[PDB]
């Protein structure tokens, strides 16, 4: 605890600086709502133009922020406290107020204190007792009281000011500013990516989302439902399928899936034998060696084209097997998104899932400098700082360890800038610079306000979710511990992954269980449900571990309410 | 939307606020939904019912006599009694009263797109556009017979003592015959044999027959069109229990008309029937992919958003899916999942 | 539709009906073209305007009577026993008289929306028609809210915008009740925009956001954004604060109805007027003119104005052989965003 320290944050705390100081004649009635009752010498220190004695006049005159008497002398407290410090101390308002919010219907001295602390620095049991015209072991009373309950905590010569003021004064400690918590983090990876971004639309703007998301293997069912749609306002199959047809992204399918979502990954044309993995290496029977012959021989064919003389029949099916699991591979792209459109539809004259033109893929570049140096560059652009944990993910080959090497030739040279930006992570957090300015907001200040509850889903695989790749998954549980998986829902609020959606509504997860804040991810899920985004609607069958619908569990019981405040009803769930 | 075939929400309220048409509610579901009768501006007091006799309290008294001598009035201008609070609350309820009653109308359907919705400034939308009295519908004389005698000759492509016990004129069709008969002998319209059912005494005009003397299966062997076309059971052009009783096959269980109840026809015959949604499933006839045809259109429907459910399907009139599969009812499920998940 | 980026007609009917706007039109232009005031309800009698003076013949009388002690009525139950045919001329041309002037007022923005259509059960009076309620007589309270709602719509208030908008007292009862705002503390009371070298009172939070767009004292190459607007919505500076750029010493162009600014960078380059066959252009620059054309085709493309294939200038209109510097940077402009030339030298 820093004494220096120790001074600006219970400065700027308590509306002290020339900075963040009241300007208007309601930003003073923030002040009385914000930290607790205050005399109107006081608040001259607050407010900018010292001529107060008319704008608290004008409270007075339009009911509001109304004065008392109590303990000695005189200071003013805003109606909504007028309530709770009556039943205090002092005497009543007087009964020219509305008095609609003065009824209380709890205890007022658990709550008079509580915010009267969460506001200064480091205090003294004595002096709170004379603010409050107190004695002095009644004071005591509630500190103890207020320790037992996780608010008030010891400070050397307050729980929320102790986290801030270790924060500050290790970070001082070190030549460093004060990093932000892993949460803002969790808030700024999305919007570093467009998510709900309005400024992105149209084929210039997907053309844009593709070159920060490339290289990076996503499965088939969520493109074009869950990755675009989100980021490219306004998003038609037509615009995605008229720039593959072009020469201007290369879709190429790596991994492979036994429902048939395999991992495509999409690439520039520019740029494609530096972010294309080389291969699958599987056997090459008769049918594999006779595609790759003509169809890499030239440029590109037609389905019909690749086969000779016998054009179908039992050996159409089987080239078609051979073919479409030759893309999955890596070996051949098609020249257009559609027939994978088709793929996903399943079994459900001429037959989609082979239509395009196919082609083969260009020979992926030798390992070399060049291609670690693009590597770095790019994964630079799409995380924002990235982290020894999501190069862990991204498993881009060398591991770290190869990374580290040139991507301290970068920061040596002068393109990025080393620190420790976010809260509680490695300590090599390499960060181009522009980006750490607009890391520099979502920075949540010192002083206490009502959360925003702004509520984001995206796909549990999704290069957006951060969880997974730099922020670790909350240990919550140990027997069912969640994983980046196919078709896996991750609701967060703020960055704090209030839900975990696993497979439809298969599975429902309650890490972060709180009150009016699984509404918002509610909500958010809801909207994807009616927009038809998300492609079926959903179950919800388990919660936690399946939870029967007697003996209720406790740490359950606000998931279900809040589920009952959206559309989904009360039907018993897979009645089949 | 179904035989508009391009429809916007936003199309019926145009025509609602220019004034050709009449909202005009009768009846009730419960919670809300109803039964909306649509009307036109020029004949309202000829089609139009009379009332419904409601306990008329005081709460209701005070509305009827401001909507009484002038038009439309506003919710917020209905009384003077403030509409914040309980007392302004317990009016909403006091008027949708009045309404399903079939006294005043709201001439923007908004409102009734609201109760759809569900129970959960003047921010709520219940009660939003401009409510006003209904006007008062003429006694029954010799023009109401008339025009209700030619309205029905158009709705119906022939009017028979089915569809007529449906409709449920006033009089029965004892009374309408007489009027239906002044008619023919004066011209106007044809009586014939058209259906071979349905007795011997079907009006027609001229004009109509024409058409329907088409449609008739050829005398010849051929694979039928196998068409589908899926209604609601209450919908005026459904037959079946106009005209047309429901099979005498499956009938110990009725299926009945009523909300909500689709009713998928294959070009004629009866195939399948639902209940109040996706629950429960009558296969009255049986057929080889009929139902294919008639699965089809409910899976095109669902997909189109037109009705809300997706259709679980879970009990069969004999509620045999899981346990003891009839060998009948094994091609009503075999036709449905090539068709849809049915979960 | 500039300012509410997905706007279908009927998005708008769909408030007017729910009883949260009033219309209530307040003056005539022409035929087929009005002044149209939209109001909010919960707070209409303050923001309304006392009922204008007309004849008042008889008809007129009957119109009203009927429509004042009642809330309000369709076309045709207005009178009794009166058909389109002789009768409803006269007593149509009553009523869309009597509107203009701002006695009634629709239920519904359909009949404004035929009567711009042009001469070509009737489109153009369908919807309930209502009688207005009276403005609140001017008080202290009007004045307060006044006040309050021109500092809502003007960033920062000046002795111009005042001057323009239509407010009794003048500027002279403004400051004085604005004064008290001040004192009480509402107000930031600053000298916030120089050339209006006034005193522009704004609010404590607009400044702070009126501080950005300060010009960076670096040089800079511009951003050159083009916005095109109608030269009388209140987004439009000049001629209520700002005053004219003060060219073309007799022609003067205004806040006429139907005309175009359209400003590229904060500067007007252009000025249209009374629907294409003027162009104004006012110390043009260079690669400027390339941004406002192209934000007056991007308008005519999407359709939001009909198409300008008039075109002139102060008087060198068309194929002047004593061409000017000034009115060739015009035509460079015109042609490279792809305008026709010389299609005709009239239009019928």
Request: aromatic share 8%; proline share 5%; with cysteine.
């Amino acid at each position: 605890l820093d004494p220096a320290v120790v001074a600006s944050t219970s400065a700027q705390l308590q509306h002290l600086t020339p900075e963040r100081a009241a300007r208007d004649a309601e930003g003073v009635a923030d002040l009385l709502r914000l930290l607790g009752p205050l005399t109107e010498a006081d608040i001259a220190q607050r407010c900018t133009a010292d001529n107060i004695g008319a704008w608290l006049d004008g409270l007075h005159a339009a009911k509001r922020a109304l004065p008392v008497t109590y303990a000695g002398q005189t200071w003013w407290a805003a109606v909504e406290d007028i309530g709770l410090l009556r039943d205090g101390i002092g005497v009543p308002v007087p009964v020219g107020v509305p008095a609609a919010f003065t009824e209380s219907a709890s205890d007022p001295l658990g709550d008079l204190i509580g915010r009267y602390a969460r506001t200064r620095g480091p205090f003294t049991t004595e002096q709170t007792a004379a603010r409050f015209g107190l004695g002095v072991r009644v004071a005591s009373d509630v500190l103890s009281r207020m320790a037992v309950d996780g608010r008030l905590i010891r400070g050397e010569f307050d729980a929320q000011v102790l986290k801030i003021l270790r924060r500050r004064s290790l970070a001082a400690l070190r030549a460093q500013v004060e990093p932000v918590s892993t949460d803002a983090y969790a808030r700024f990876l999305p919007s570093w990516q467009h998510v709900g971004s309005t400024n992105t639309t149209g084929v210039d703007g997907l053309a844009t989302v593709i070159e920060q998301l490339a290289g990076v293997p996503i499965p088939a069912s969520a493109v074009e439902s869950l990755v675009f749609p989100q980021r490219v306002r306004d998003y038609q199959p037509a615009m995605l399928d008229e720039l593959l047809a072009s020469g201007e992204v290369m879709w190429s399918g790596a991994g492979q899936i036994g429902n048939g979502d395999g991992w495509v990954a999409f690439h520039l044309a520019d740029t494609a034998p530096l972010t294309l993995t080389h291969g699958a290496e599987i056997e090459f029977t008769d049918t594999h060696r006779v595609i790759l012959e003509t169809l890499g021989h030239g440029g590109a064919y037609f389905f019909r084209q690749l086969t000779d003389g016998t054009v179908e029949g039992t050996a159409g099916q089987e080239l078609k097997q051979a073919l479409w699991e030759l893309i999955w591979a890596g070996w051949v792209t098609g020249d257009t998104f559609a027939p994978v459109r088709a793929v996903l539809s399943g079994p459900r004259g001429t037959d989609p899932t082979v239509s395009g033109r196919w082609s083969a893929l260009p020979a992926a570049e030798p390992d070399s400098t060049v291609r670690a140096h693009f590597q770095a560059e790019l994964l630079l652009g799409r995380h924002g700082v990235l982290t020894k944990g999501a190069v862990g993910a991204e498993g881009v080959p060398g591991g770290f360890a190869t990374l580290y090497k040139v991507l301290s030739a970068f920061e040596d040279a002068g393109r990025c800038q080393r620190g420790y930006f976010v809260e509680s992570l490695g300590g090599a957090q390499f960060a181009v610079a522009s980006t750490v300015d607009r890391l520099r907001s979502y920075l949540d200040n010192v002083d206490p306000e009502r959360p925003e509850y702004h509520a984001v889903v995206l796909a549990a695989t999704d290069p957006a979710n951060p969880y997974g790749a730099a922020l670790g998954w909350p240990t919550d549980s140990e027997a069912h511990r969640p994983g980046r998986k196919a078709g896996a829902l991750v609701a967060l609020v703020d960055g704090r992954l209030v839900w975990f959606l696993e497979r439809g509504g298969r599975s429902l997860l309650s890490f972060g269980a709180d009150a009016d804040a699984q509404r918002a991810a509610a909500g958010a899920l809801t909207d994807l449900v009616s927009a038809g985004r998300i492609p079926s609607l959903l179950v919800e069958r388990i919660n936690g571990v399946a939870v029967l619908d007697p003996d209720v569990d406790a740490e359950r019981a606000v998931v279900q309410d809040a589920l009952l405040g959206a559309g989904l009803s009360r039907t018993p769930r897979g009645l089949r | 939307p179904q035989r508009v075939r391009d429809y916007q929400p936003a199309m019926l309220d145009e025509l609602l606020a220019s004034g050709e048409v009449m909202w005009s509610g009768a009846g009730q579901i419960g919670n809300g939904d109803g039964w909306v009768a649509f009307h036109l501006a020029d004949t309202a007091p000829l089609t139009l019912t009379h009332g419904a006799e409601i306990e008329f309290t005081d709460t209701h008294r005070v509305i009827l006599e401001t909507l009484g001598h002038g038009g439309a009035y506003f919710f917020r201008q209905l009384t003077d009694g403030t509409v914040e609070g309980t007392a302004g609350q317990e009016l909403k309820q006091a008027l949708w009263e009045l309404i399903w009653a079939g006294w005043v109308t709201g001439d923007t359907f908004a409102p009734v797109r609201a109760v759809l919705s569900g129970p959960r400034r003047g921010t709520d939308p219940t009660v939003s556009g401009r409510w006003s009295a209904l006007p008062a519908a003429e006694p029954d004389s010799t023009v109401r017979a008339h025009f209700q005698a030619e309205l029905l000759l158009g709705r119906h492509g022939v009017l028979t003592k089915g569809a007529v016990g449906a409709e449920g004129v006033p009089g029965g069709f004892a009374t309408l015959y007489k009027v239906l008969s002044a008619f023919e002998d004066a011209g106007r319209c044809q009586r014939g044999y058209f259906v071979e059912s349905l007795g011997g005494a079907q009006f027609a005009v001229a004009s109509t027959v024409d058409r329907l003397r088409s449609y008739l299966d050829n005398v010849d062997p051929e694979r039928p069109e196998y068409h589908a076309v899926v209604l609601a059971a209450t919908d005026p052009a459904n037959p079946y229990g106009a005209a047309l009783g429901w099979p005498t096959d499956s009938e110990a269980h009725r299926p009945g008309r009523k909300a909500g109840a689709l009713v998928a026809l294959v070009d004629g015959r009866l195939v399948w029937f639902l209940e109040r949604g996706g629950r429960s499933l009558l296969s009255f006839g049986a057929d080889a992919d009929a139902q294919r045809a008639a699965a089809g259109a409910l899976t095109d429907l669902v997909s189109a958003g037109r009705i809300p459910s997706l259709l679980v399907e879970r009990i069969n009139g004999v509620a045999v899916l899981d346990p003891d599969v009839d060998a009948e009812r094994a091609v009503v499920q075999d036709a449905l999942l090539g068709a849809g998940l049915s979960r | 539709p500039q300012r509410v980026r997905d706007y279908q007609p009927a998005m708008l009917d769909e408030l007017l009906a729910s009883g949260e706007v009033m219309w209530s039109g307040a003056g005539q232009i022409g035929n087929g073209d009005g002044w149209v005031a939209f109001h909010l309800a919960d707070t209409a009698p303050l923001t309304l305007t006392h009922g204008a003076e007309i004849e008042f013949t008889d008809t007129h009388r009957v119109i009203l009577e009927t429509l004042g002690h009642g809330g309000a009525y369709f076309f045709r139950q207005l009178t009794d026993g009166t058909v389109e045919g002789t009768a409803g001329q006269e007593l149509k041309q009553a009523l869309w008289e009597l509107i203009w002037a701002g006695w009634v007022t629709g239920d519904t923005f359909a009949p404004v929306r035929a009567v711009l259509s042009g001469p070509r059960t009737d489109p153009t009076v369908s919807g309930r028609w209502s009688a207005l309620p009276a403005a609140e007589p001017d008080s202290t309270v009007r004045a307060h809210f006044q006040a309050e709602l021109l500092l809502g719509r003007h960033g920062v208030l000046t002795k111009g915008a005042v001057g323009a908008e239509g407010v009794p007292g003048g500027f002279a009862t403004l400051y004085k009740v604005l004064s008290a705002f001040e004192d009480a503390g509402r107000c930031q009371r600053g000298y916030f925009v120089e050339s209006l070298g006034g005193a522009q009172f704004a609010v404590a939070s607009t400044v702070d956001r009126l501080r950005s767009y300060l010009d960076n004292v670096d040089p800079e190459r511009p951003e050159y954004h083009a916005v095109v607007l109608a030269a009388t919505d209140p987004a439009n500076p000049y001629g209520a604060a700002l005053g004219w750029p003060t060219d073309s010493e007799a022609h003067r162009p205004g806040r006429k109805a139907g005309a175009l600014v359209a400003l590229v960078d904060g500067r007007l380059v252009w000025f249209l007027e009374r629907g294409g066959r003027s162009l104004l252009s006012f110390g043009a620059d260079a690669d400027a003119q390339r941004a406002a054309a192209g934000a007056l085709t991007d308008l005519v493309s999407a359709g939001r104005i009909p198409s300008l294939l008039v075109e002139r200038i102060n008087g060198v209109a068309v194929l002047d052989p004593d061409v000017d510097a000034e009115r060739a940077v015009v035509q460079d402009a015109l042609l490279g965003a792809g305008l026709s030339r010389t299609p005709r030298g009239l239009r019928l």
